[PDB]
Design a protein around this ligand. Structure first.
Ligand code: CL7
Ligand code: CL7
Ligand code: CL7
Ligand code: CL7
Ligand code: CL7
Ligand code: CL7
Ligand code: CL7
Ligand SMILES: CCCCCCCCCCCCCCCC(=O)OC[C@H](CO[C@@H]1O[C@H](CS(=O)(=O)O)[C@@H](O)[C@H](O)[C@H]1O)OC(=O)CCCCCCCCCCCCCCC
Ligand SMILES: CC1=C(/C=C/C(C)=C/C=C/C(C)=C/C=C/C=C(C)/C=C/C=C(C)/C=C/C2=C[C@H](C)[C@H](O)CC2(C)C)C(C)(C)C[C@@H](O)C1
Ligand SMILES: CC1=C(/C=C/C(C)=C/C=C/C(C)=C/C=C/C=C(C)/C=C/C=C(C)/C=C/C2=C[C@H](C)[C@H](O)CC2(C)C)C(C)(C)C[C@@H](O)C1
Ligand SMILES: CC1=C(/C=C/C(C)=C/C=C/C(C)=C/C=C/C=C(C)/C=C/C=C(C)/C=C/C2=C[C@H](C)[C@H](O)CC2(C)C)C(C)(C)C[C@@H](O)C1
Lengths: 68, 63, 349, 344, 331
């Protein structure tokens, strides 16, 4: 159990609050919303990549490279 | 970078920058929260956050 | 000295010259020796320069500080700044060396004559010279006598310029100069009103008048200080210690050195072009410089360059030394600086 | 300083000045030092610019800040905005350096031999100048004297402009300018009526008339504050500590700096083009800045660019410091920031 | 803190902690207004920075310049932007307003007293004491805010009619348009009774500036009268008290007319969502108030954005806070 200097610096981040949790649900409800949000985001991207969704003036193909 | 919707065109490189900026910030916030916030008993017991094997499982799925 | 609190301080040899701050005889000896060193420099360097003088090379191109100064004040310079006869320089250097020997003899005399303190010496008339680092009356008399000597020197310059003549680059040849006297024009040079700027004096007549004025002022002040004790307010303001007087003198000298450094680089009359070289220009990068204003290619630097830069540095570091000694004499010990990176306040009297 | 409740506060070297906040002699010494450094910068960089100056290239495209401002007040420019001689610049710089030396001497004195606390000085002329952070009556007279100096300087600038004359970009030379002054005009400028936008003054006569008005205002205010105590309601409104006065002063400086930066950016009568360069355009992105109407390639950046851009951020961070010190004087502890997260 | 759902003291819900703290709540609203006012000025300055004269506004993607140009700011005949400085002035003035609001919010969050119930007994600040139960207190708040909104609307109308007017779409340039004050004609739009027949989009089928300006005069006068009503009376009436409400507080309709903090918030949120949907219809169809010289012709995206926001506020926020308030009426 060497008491190095860097260990002194980092031990608080390592295991100061090890094994601690808040009871109940806590922030879990909020997390739910975030997941749903990204579940739309990714979905939209997929369809945009899939050409299911066609955004206005956004030609999902090699033609969009025009301008470089 | 441009935040107009045509940055979601996968073939236009202006999206990539626009991604790595915004997503980058999103991770920083996401970092800060997790550097401070504790888990929840419910999730902590469900996912067994005390056991590194759960981190392995989730990381392998992500990869 | 200072000796913050604790007296009887022990000084290493590196700071060993502070040991005799209380031994009046040794103090005299040290300063006579220093003046001997100065005049020895003058004479010996004059000869050292004469040895390698080239009439073909222009005077300022070769590295000199003494031949231009002698040639400026008469002393064997022909028309158009020509060094006709090189013997008067030899005579001047020789007299300086003889004076140096005299001064050094006096220095050793006092370093070995009697007691370290001039109070105890049983000469009963050398005791008239023992001083104190607290009494302002004696130091006022001393100041008066030294001012008398300075005024007598300025008078001698005025006389020698009146009779023997003196070089005038505007005239172009050694010439007697009438001593002007116009207090109005003296004060107009004091204000630096647009016509008259002190560092751009054009007529040696104005210089001579100013020197006459300076001689009068110094002699009058010397008489006044010999006769009159300092007023009480001067005891209120100034501290009475040796290091304090060193600080005052150092500040004055630093100012004078900076003034002379600026004088060299700019004025063309009192520093003629044919002897010292073309005027310099003051530059300021990190630190002030004086640019030669001439191609240093195959010509080195003019003597004016060397004089101006050396005296800028002399003046600057005399100012820094003045700050150091004033800070000590007021009571500030620099050891407290070591407490900078701690939580203890870096501050005392 | 704030020192929430606790006494005998320990300040690390990185926050060291707070230590002398409660001593008046050292306070004076520190501020003498600060103004000495300002004056020293003025003189030193006058000399520096003169040393790096070419009478050939355009003035504004050369990186300069002191020569153009000195020229704008005369002193070396004859016509067409070209610097002819350089010596008056050198003289002004030398006077500034000497004044800096004197002020720094005052500061160094205040540190060593001057009284640490003025009230404790034996001189009893020094005990006149002692002050306390909670006494608005004395600080009123201090304010009055400083306002007097400000107004005297403004009046001096006015008279120098009138008699000696300043640059006139409309005229193209140095002119002696008569003051075109009318109160109705100045209220038109204050209300920004369509013909009168105060950032777009067109005639220096109006500028100097405004300076006469401003000098009169400052002198009147100085006399008023020397003579008249602050009212009782001021005790209810304001706070009583050094940090609070620092916050007010920072707010005032931020306001002045924003006005100055915008002035430099948009006006072209006070800042003639031949000296400072073409006018700038405000541009917002993630952070505001002023950009050159003309091309900045091959010419670096004009003097106007540097001055206005620098002072915008001086003003902005002065505002941030104003907020910081105001909140500190409100008793708000910033140790709450790394503490709240610990609780969560 | 005046709530006991399950998670009152959670940091991610911490704003509820200011439910009764009047001073802190006032500061929080002021800081929020500072945000709401910073955005327009900042984005107007940013827009004017990149504005190009030759190209028209709809092709430059400006989302604040069109609304300013609709009021005759910096435009001339033919609907082309001439001078850009007045937009910059508008942005700067919004900066000033935001700075004042932020100063107030900082004062009331830290320097000011947290709870005005702790004010020093008629110290110019007990007059601002309010309670989420007594009706009289909140009545004067509603009245004064109505005063301000009414004065704003009247000012807009007066400017349009007398001073420098607005950019009239039909007349093709900026004009002081003569208002139409036929009250039956104006209030007919609310049911779709446009002069050219019934229309699906109420209030949005106006085909002339005179109708809108007359409507604004009418709204200003109505709101001023309502402001007088609420300031001068402050007393509950048999409209609020004794009206039917359906709630599980008592299963089935009841005439209680309950009052609560969450309930007031819910009504306000529903109102905002409704305004969002109405504005959605407006920008979809009404091109008198949105000249396609500036906002472009196709405007489905902005209308959809408004629709989504209106649904989120009216349905989501309104329902959530209404249900919470009704449940809290079990005290
Ligand atoms: C940036 C916003 C800001 C503004 C503009 C501002 N302050 Mg502050 N400000 C003060 C004065 C002040 C004045 C007079 C003033 C008006 O101009 C301002 N401020 C203005 C002091 C009373 C008070 C303490 C000031 C104080 O002690 O400042 C010292 C701070 C710094 C960074 C010096 C580091 C700068 C150099 C790069 C590094 C030098 C190293 C050195 C070369 C090596 C050794 C040399 C040696 C061996 C010879 C203060 C604070 C403080 C803060 C903070 C965060 C600020 N401020 C901020 C501001 C304290 O912590 C702090 C505070 O109160 O915490 C307790
Ligand atoms: C370089 C700045 C400087 C200047 C120009 C300067 N001194 Mg010093 N200076 C002295 C004389 C002096 C004279 C007569 C003199 C001008 O003719 C000067 N100085 C000038 C001696 C009394 C004294 C020791 C001489 C010595 O150390 O030899 C001295 C010091 C000392 C120092 C230091 C750092 C200085 N100095 C510095 C200067 C001692 O520690 C050191 C000191 O006081 O240690 C306690
Ligand atoms: C001429 C060589 C010499 C020089 C350079 C010299 N003295 Mg003397 N000199 C003095 C001052 C002095 C000063 C202030 C000074 C520099 O300006 C000098 N000296 C310089 C007086 C303190 C002291 C009194 C004589 C006196 O007249 O004073 C003195 C002496 C004395 C002598 C002698 C022989 C000297 N000296 C000699 C010198 C005493 O015996 C004689 C003496 O008393 O020896 C102890
Ligand atoms: C000229 C050098 C210098 C400067 C620039 C300077 N003082 Mg002083 N100065 C004062 C104010 C002052 C202010 C407000 C101020 C700002 O401009 C300065 N000073 C500046 C008074 C508090 C104080 C009373 C004298 C007085 O102000 O009358 C003072 C002094 C004093 C001195 C001395 C020597 C100085 N100073 C010197 C300076 C006292 O003995 C003397 C002193 O401290 O005796 C105890
Ligand atoms: C995360 C949920 C959250 C949001 C987004 C939010 N608040 Mg609060 N909020 C307020 C305004 C506000 C405004 C104007 C606003 C948006 O416009 C918000 N809030 C928004 C103040 C009027 C009021 C006082 C705030 C107050 O006292 O602030 C001083 C104290 C602290 C620590 C400063 C906060 C700094 C953050 C830690 C920064 C960390 C970032 C990281 C380093 C990177 C307030 C509260 C408070 C809390 C809590 C827990 C919150 N909040 C939480 C939030 C009080 O207890 C507290 C309260 O009232 O307790 C009684
Ligand atoms: C259903 C028949 C009718 C009634 C009872 C009615 N409206 Mg409407 N009505 C409005 C107010 C209103 C009030 C204050 C009110 C009184 O209770 C009513 N209405 C009532 C405006 C907010 C709004 C104008 C936007 C409105 C409309 C609109 C319509 C239509 C067709 C109506 N209505 C019709 C009615 C819009 O285009 C249009 C619509 O689609 O929104 C529902
Ligand atoms: C003059 C027309 C007028 C306008 C402009 C107006 N009200 Mg009323 N109005 C309210 C809000 C309101 C808001 C938030 C608001 C603007 O957004 C308005 N009003 C506007 C509620 C606080 C309150 C209960 C409404 C309720 O739910 O019943 C109300 C009423 C009421 C009345 C009356 C007569 C009015 N009003 C009148 C108005 C109640 O009796 C009646 C009343 O006083 O009941 C005690
Ligand atoms: C101090 C101890 C003694 C030093 C003695 C040598 C001085 C050298 C000098 O003056 O260099 C002159 C040069 C400038 O060049 C000069 O620059 C001049 C132009 S200007 O003044 O730089 O604009 C130019 O005319 C000149 O020819 C050129 O040499 O100065 C420097 O380079 C100074 C660099 C200092 C860096 C920081 C040092 C900190 C620790 C000390
Ligand atoms: C003010 C004060 C202090 C400061 C005191 C100080 C240090 C005061 C400073 C005094 C100075 C710097 C005095 C300088 C005086 C300069 C003089 C008298 C110049 C004389 C120059 C002459 C006569 C030149 C003459 C010619 C010479 C030359 C040829 C010219 O071509 C022309 C011509 C003929 C004019 C403290 C700090 C000590 C104590 C404080 O409490 C009070
Ligand atoms: C209300 C309030 C307060 C006040 C808070 C504030 C914000 C106070 C602010 C005061 C300000 C910002 C005053 C600003 C005044 C600006 C003035 C007076 C402009 C003056 C310009 C003049 C006089 C002439 C300028 C020219 C002169 C110049 C030479 C040119 O020729 C142009 C020309 C003609 C414009 C407190 C602090 C008292 C209490 C707080 O809690 C709330
Ligand atoms: C109190 C109550 C409840 C609530 C009932 C509800 C939902 C009541 C709804 C109340 C509303 C929606 C009132 C709003 C009225 C809107 C008005 C009066 C708008 C007037 C606008 C006018 C006159 C503007 C007109 C123009 C002005 C405008 C500038 C344009 O140029 C167009 C043009 C010319 C038409 C419950 C649900 C709790 C229980 C109910 O039984 C009773």
């Amino acid at each position: 159990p060497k008491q190095t200097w860097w260990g002194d610096v980092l031990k608080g981040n390592n295991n100061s609050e090890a094994g601690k949790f808040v009871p109940g649900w806590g922030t879990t409800p909020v997390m739910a919303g975030f997941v749903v949000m990204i579940t739309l985001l990714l979905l939209i991207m997929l369809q945009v990549y899939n050409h299911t969704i066609v955004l206005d003036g956004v030609d999902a193909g090699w033609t969009s490279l025009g301008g470089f | 970078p441009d935040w107009r919707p045509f940055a979601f065109d996968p073939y236009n490189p202006t999206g990539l920058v626009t991604h790595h900026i915004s997503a980058g910030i999103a991770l920083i916030i996401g970092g800060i929260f997790h550097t401070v916030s504790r888990p929840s008993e419910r999730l902590y017991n469900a996912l067994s956050m005390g056991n590194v094997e759960t981190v392995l499982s989730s990381s392998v799925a992500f990869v | 000295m200072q000796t913050y609190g604790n007296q009887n301080v022990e000084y290493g040899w590196w700071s060993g010259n502070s040991r005799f701050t209380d031994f009046s005889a040794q103090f005299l000896a040290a300063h006579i020796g220093q003046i001997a060193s100065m005049t020895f420099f003058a004479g010996s360097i004059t000869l050292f320069e004469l040895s390698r003088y080239n009439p073909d090379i222009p005077l300022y191109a070769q590295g000199f500080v003494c031949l231009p100064q002698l040639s400026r004040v008469g002393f064997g310079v022909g028309a158009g700044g020509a060094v006709v006869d090189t013997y008067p320089f030899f005579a001047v250097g020789m007299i300086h060396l003889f004076a140096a020997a005299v001064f050094g003899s006096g220095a050793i005399f006092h370093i070995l004559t009697g007691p370290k303190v001039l109070a105890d010496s049983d000469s009963a008339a050398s005791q008239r010279f023992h001083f104190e680092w607290d009494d302002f009356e004696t130091q006022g008399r001393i100041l008066g006598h030294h001012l008398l000597f300075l005024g007598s020197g300025a008078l001698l310059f005025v006389v020698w310029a009146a009779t023997h003549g003196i070089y005038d680059p505007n005239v172009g040849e050694v010439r007697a100069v009438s001593p002007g006297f116009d207090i109005v024009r003296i004060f107009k040079y004091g204000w630096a009103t647009p016509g008259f700027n002190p560092f751009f004096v054009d007529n040696l007549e104005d210089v001579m008048g100013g020197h006459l004025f300076i001689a009068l002022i110094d002699i009058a002040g010397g008489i006044y200080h010999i006769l009159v004790k300092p007023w009480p307010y001067t005891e209120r303001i100034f501290t009475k210690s040796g290091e304090a007087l060193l600080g005052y003198a150092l500040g004055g000298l630093g100012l004078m050195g900076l003034v002379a450094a600026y004088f060299c680089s700019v004025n063309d009359v009192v520093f003629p072009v044919e002897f010292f070289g073309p005027v310099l220009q003051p530059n300021l990068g990190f630190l002030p410089n004086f640019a030669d204003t001439l191609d240093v290619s195959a010509s080195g630097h003019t003597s004016r360059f060397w004089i101006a830069n050396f005296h800028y540095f002399w003046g600057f570091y005399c100012i820094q030394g003045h700050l150091f000694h004033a800070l000590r004499a007021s009571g500030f010990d620099f050891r407290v600086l070591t407490k900078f990176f701690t939580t203890e306040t870096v501050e005392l009297g | 300083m704030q020192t929430y409740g606790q006494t005998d506060v320990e300040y690390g070297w990185w926050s060291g000045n707070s230590r002398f906040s409660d001593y008046s002699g050292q306070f004076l010494a520190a501020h003498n030092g600060q103004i000495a450094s300002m004056c020293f910068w003025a003189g030193s960089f006058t000399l520096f610019e003169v040393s790096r100056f070419n009478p050939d290239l355009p003035v504004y495209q050369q990186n300069l800040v002191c020569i153009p401002q000195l020229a704008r007040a005369g002193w070396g420019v004859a016509a067409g905005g070209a610097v002819v001689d350089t010596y008056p610049y050198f003289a002004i710089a030398m006077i500034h350096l000497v004044a800096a030396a004197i002020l720094g001497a005052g500061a160094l004195y205040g540190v060593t031999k001057g009284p640490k606390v003025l009230a404790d000085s034996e001189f009893s002329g020094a005990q006149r100048f002692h002050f306390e952070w909670d006494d608005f009556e004395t600080q009123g007279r201090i304010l009055g004297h400083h306002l007097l100096f400000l107004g005297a300087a403004c009046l001096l600038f006015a008279t120098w402009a009138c008699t000696h004359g300043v640059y006139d970009p409309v005229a193209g030379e140095v002119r002696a300018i008569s003051p075109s002054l009318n109160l109705v005009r100045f209220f038109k400028y204050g209300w920004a009526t369509p013909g009168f936008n105060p950032y777009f003054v067109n005639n220096l006569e109006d500028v100097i008339g405004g300076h006469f008005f401003v000098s009169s205002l400052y002198i009147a205010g100085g006399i008023w504050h020397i003579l008249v105590k602050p009212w009782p309601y001021t005790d209810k409104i304001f706070v009583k500590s050094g940090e609070a006065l620092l916050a007010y002063a920072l707010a005032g400086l931020a306001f002045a700096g924003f006005n100055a930066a915008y002035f430099c950016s948009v006006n072209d009568v006070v800042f003639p083009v031949e000296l400072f360069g073409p006018v700038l355009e405000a541009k917002l992105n993630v952070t505001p800045y002023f950009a050159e109407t003309l091309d900045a390639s091959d010419g670096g950046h004009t003097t106007r660019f540097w001055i206005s851009n620098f002072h915008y951020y001086w003003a902005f961070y002065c505002l941030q410091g104003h907020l910081f010190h105001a909140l500190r004087s409100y008793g708000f502890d910033f140790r709450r920031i790394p503490r709240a997260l610990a609780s969560l | 803190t005046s709530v006991l759902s399950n998670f009152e003291n959670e940091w991610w819900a911490g704003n509820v902690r200011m439910t009764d703290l009047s001073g802190m709540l006032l500061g929080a609203h002021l800081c929020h207004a500072a945000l709401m006012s910073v955005v327009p000025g900042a984005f107007i300055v940013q827009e004017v920075a990149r504005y190009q004269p030759g190209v028209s506004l709809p092709d430059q993607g400006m989302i604040f310049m069109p609304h300013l140009a609709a009021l005759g700011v910096g435009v001339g005949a033919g609907g082309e932007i001439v001078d850009t400085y007045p937009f910059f002035v508008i942005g700067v003035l919004h900066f000033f307003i935001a700075a004042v609001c932020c100063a107030a919010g900082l004062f009331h969050t830290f320097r000011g007293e947290t709870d005005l119930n702790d004010a020093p007994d008629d110290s110019y600040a007990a007059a601002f004491r309010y309670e989420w139960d007594d009706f009289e207190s909140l009545s004067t708040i509603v009245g004064h805010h109505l005063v301000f909104i009414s004065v704003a609307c009247l000012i807009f109308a007066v400017n349009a009619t007398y001073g420098t007017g607005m950019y009239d779409i039909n007349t093709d340039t900026v004009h002081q348009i003569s208002p139409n004050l036929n009250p039956i004609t104006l209030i007919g739009y609310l049911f779709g009774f446009t002069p050219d027949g019934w229309s699906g989009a109420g209030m949005a089928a106006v085909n002339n500036m005179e109708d809108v300006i007359g409507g604004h005069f009418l709204i200003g006068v109505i709101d001023l009268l309502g402001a007088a009503f609420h300031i001068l009376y402050r007393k509950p009436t048999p409209l609020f008290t004794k009206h039917p409400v359906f709630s599980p507080a008592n299963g089935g309709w009841s005439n209680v007319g309950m009052l609560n903090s969450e309930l007031i918030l819910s009504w306000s949120v529903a109102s905002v969502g409704f305004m969002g949907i109405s504005s959605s219809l407006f920008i979809r169809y009404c091109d008198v108030a949105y000249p396609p010289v500036f906002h472009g012709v196709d405007r489905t995206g902005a209308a959809t954005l408004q629709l989504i926001l209106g649904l989120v506020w009216m349905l989501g926020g309104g329902l959530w806070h209404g249900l919470r308030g009704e449940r809290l009426y079990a005290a």
